[PDB]
Design a protein around this ligand. Sequence first.
Ligand code: BDM
Length: 162
Amino acid sequence: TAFLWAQDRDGLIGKDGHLPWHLPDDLHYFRAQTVGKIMVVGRRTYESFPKRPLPERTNVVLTHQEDYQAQGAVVVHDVAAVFAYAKQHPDQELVIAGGAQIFTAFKDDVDTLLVTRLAGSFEGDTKMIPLNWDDFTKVSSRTVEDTNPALTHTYEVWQKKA
Ligand SMILES: COc1cc(Cc2c[nH+]c(N)nc2N)cc(OCCC[C@@H](CCC(=O)[O-])C(=O)[O-])c1Br
């Protein structure tokens, strides 16, 4: 299982139910880090995607609303239904794309961290969840410089130690 996210310097992830920034290079990497996989999102992060569902992946939407309708997405109500879906498909990797209430609900079962780190600081209201960064190694780090310098970003792959 991987966590897919992008933060600012301080660990901010969201503002007012949307992204605090617009970064196109990172949302092209959101597409193709999840083209083909089982993508898990909380119900609020699903509703804030422009296309609903976004294509070519399984979108799994976690919601406590028994009646919630998302045509073409896998609508489930608890974590044990996400893993009971992921057990049915042994060839598709599980990717937890957020927000903060879903990254709490799979905190214990993550093995990889796919972080984008923005060099700047943005205003918002949601942070990334606290994680034991000492339990993971940074394997791979690739920087991309943007002509807005707050938007210069590093893509970092972390993998959990034995
Ligand atoms: C709510 O706002 C968003 C937040 C994210 C969240 C997010 C972004 N980036 C990263 N790396 N981690 C995240 N958790 C993704 C997203 O759409 C991904 C869009 C993929 C599009 C192509 C987008 C593009 O043209 O760049 C597609 O059609 O597959 C949107 Br819109």
